[PDB]
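In response to a reviewer's request, we include the raw inputs and outputs for one of the modeled complexes. The two entities were modeled together in a single run.
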Amino acid sequence: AFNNFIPELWSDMLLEEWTAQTVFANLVNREYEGIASKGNVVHIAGVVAPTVKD
Amino acid sequence: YKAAGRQTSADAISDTGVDLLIDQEKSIDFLVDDIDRVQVAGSLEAYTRAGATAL
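The model returned the following structure tokens for the whole complex.
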């Protein structure tokens, strides 16, 4: 038969990866991004409540 | 046909072929020093023409 004159076709589009939808960066707290515009650490501190005495 | 009695039958047609390969890839790559470009007696443009002529 025709061993040389029958072509093969290439699709001009690549298939994209199917990738998981990213969600977590919108669910967690972002407030420290203003202060963290500089430096490589943020120190976050919390109260220790005074003890109720009898 | 006259030796086949008077019989005939179809043959299958065929092809041949050759491949042109775009497999040669050649380059020019050179430096013109900024100190030399300032200190020489005239233009260095000729080295670009020389590289193009070499390709």
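As requested, we also summarize the result in words. The interface with chain B takes residues 1-5 of chain A (CB under 8 Å). The CA atoms of residues 9 and 15 of chain A lie 15 Å apart.
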